[PDB]
């Protein structure tokens, strides 16, 4: 599903970690339950990190989204990650869009900016993204 090789970034969103939703689709926020492509070390949490698909749940929103597990992508982080180019960066927030496993969006747009990493990894978020 994920279009390309996700280069590593600092882990920011462990489990639970709610994050604002960046899509219009009316997940008012997302609770990171679990992370896709997580390892599995005894007594350590699944950490999401920008781009990593997660399996969120909507803790607040319109209830057609609520009380059902559903995948989502983290498009913003705030734990300052390092680009291989040399810089660090970090957004003012952690945030994601709710998605399907194919990497397509629920919502037709994305508020705020997105990480170029996240844009590179999925075609669709770059499309629904403004600033990257």
């Amino acid at each position: 599903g994920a279009q390309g090789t996700k280069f590593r970034i600092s882990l920011g969103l462990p489990t639970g970690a709610i994050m604002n939703c960046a899509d219009n689709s009316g997940a008012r926020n997302l609770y990171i339950m679990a992370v896709k492509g997580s390892g599995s070390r005894l007594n350590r949490l699944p950490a999401a990190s920008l781009g990593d698909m997660v399996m969120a749940t909507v803790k607040k929103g319109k209830p057609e989204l609520r009380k059902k597990v559903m995948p989502a992508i983290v498009v913003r982080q705030s734990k300052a990650w390092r680009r291989k180019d040399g810089v660090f960066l970090y957004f003012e927030d952690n945030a994601g869009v709710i998605a399907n496993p194919k990497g397509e969006m629920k919502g037709s747009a994305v508020t705020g900016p997105v990480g170029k990493e996240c844009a590179d990894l999925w075609p669709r978020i770059a499309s629904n993204s403004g600033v990257v």
Binding site: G4, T5, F7, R41, L42, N43, K84, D85, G86, D120
Partner: protein, 384 residues
């Protein structure tokens, strides 16, 4: 009963036991094996770790997302003053390993070296190599037989070398001796090679070339004693716990009724001898040069010494090796740089490195600027 959450183990077993390592010299144990086609050359080299800086380099990994881009990589810098070949050793293939047959030295040994053989030089009357230097008086009769002897037997010839410590910034005086193998075709050539090199020096430029993997060998930093959690990397016990946290809880179990050797417990950390490996070299600088750091791209005449010296180390007024990434050891510490023992066709090793830029900024702070020149321009000027 049984484990329950069969988690992977803390600490590498192999790197036990965690002593201090008898020396502070890297002491390369193994050298590359043979090459009859190739000429005689030093397998290794002794440096002095100056510290670290960034580099901004291109990137020629076709297929990586970062292909054809500026990419900051960290980097150590290692002073490498011209080595001084001082002696030869021999070694014979016994059943019970190797065994040194003999040593020959120079006529004259620098007070750099001689100092190594004393602990109280200042008191001594400095007879290290005198009656030996008087072997050479008889034309060269006793010496020729010694080097003949090696040339006769001797599977392997290690050349004693030593470190110019008078071309460093170190308060040290005592130079570091070292054996280093030669790996050329034939021993008759090796011995003759090193017979033509007593007292004579060896620059790095000769041994290592730019864009070449180098298995660096050093003594790691230091620390001293150290509790489990920080040495082995175990979990702390929960905050609630009586009699403290930074601890393994349950060593072993009733039977066997001894503490296993595989159990994490505290005492020395660091000061360990770690060869590392595959440390690519990015540049091979020179002492009689300004504009060492200056690239094909940059063209700003500046030295690889950062602003106000490498912290602790000192300056650099010398030939050096820019290595990629970290290296075991401190600054000031001797690092024995050794050629890799095998042909890497990793592509990573093969990438024709070209430095785009180097960070010459002060490391004793947060340096905004690279040169003082630039600091005049930027500030203006003034007021002093």
């Amino acid at each position: 009963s049984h484990r329950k959450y069969e988690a992977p183990r803390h600490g590498h077993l192999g790197f036990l036991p965690r002593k201090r390592a008898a020396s502070v010299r890297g002491r390369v144990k193994s050298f590359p094996k043979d090459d009859q086609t190739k000429p005689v050359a030093l397998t290794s080299f002794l440096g002095y770790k100056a510290g670290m800086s960034t580099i901004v380099r291109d990137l020629d990994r076709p297929g990586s997302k970062f292909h054809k881009r500026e990419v900051v990589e960290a980097v150590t810098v290692v002073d490498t003053p011209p080595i001084v070949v001082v002696g030869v050793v021999g070694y014979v293939e016994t059943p019970r390993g190797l065994r040194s047959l003999t040593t020959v030295w120079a006529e004259h040994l620098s007070d750099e070296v001689k100092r190594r053989f004393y602990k109280n030089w200042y008191k001594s009357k400095k007879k290290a190599f005198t009656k030996y230097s008087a072997k050479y008086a008889e034309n060269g009769a006793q010496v020729d037989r010694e080097l003949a002897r090696i040339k006769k037997y001797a599977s392997v010839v290690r050349v004693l070398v030593h470190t110019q410590v008078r071309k460093t910034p170190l308060s040290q005086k005592k130079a570091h001796l070292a054996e280093i193998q030669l790996n050329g075709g034939s021993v008759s050539d090796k011995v003759d090679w090193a017979k033509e090199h007593f007292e004579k020096t060896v620059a790095v430029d000769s041994v290592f070339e730019q864009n070449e993997m180098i298995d660096v060998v050093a003594v790691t930093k230091g620390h001293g004693f150290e509790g489990v959690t920080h040495r082995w990397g175990t979990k702390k016990l929960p905050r609630k716990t009586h009699r403290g946290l930074r601890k393994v809880a349950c060593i072993g179990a009733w039977h066997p009724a001894h503490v296993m050797w595989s159990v994490a417990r505290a005492g020395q950390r660091g000061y360990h001898h770690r060869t590392s490996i595959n440390h690519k070299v990015y540049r091979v600088g020179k002492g009689d040069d300004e504009a060492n750091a200056a690239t094909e791209f940059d063209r700003t005449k500046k030295t690889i010494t950062p602003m106000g010296g490498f912290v602790h180390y000192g300056a650099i007024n010398n030939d050096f090796v820019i290595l990629k990434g970290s290296i075991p050891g401190t600054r000031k510490r001797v690092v024995t740089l050794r050629k890799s023992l095998y042909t890497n066709t990793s592509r990573k090793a093969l990438e024709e490195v070209t430095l785009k830029w180097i960070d010459t900024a002060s490391k004793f702070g947060k340096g905004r600027f690279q040169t003082p020149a630039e600091k005049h321009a930027f500030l203006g000027t003034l007021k002093k």
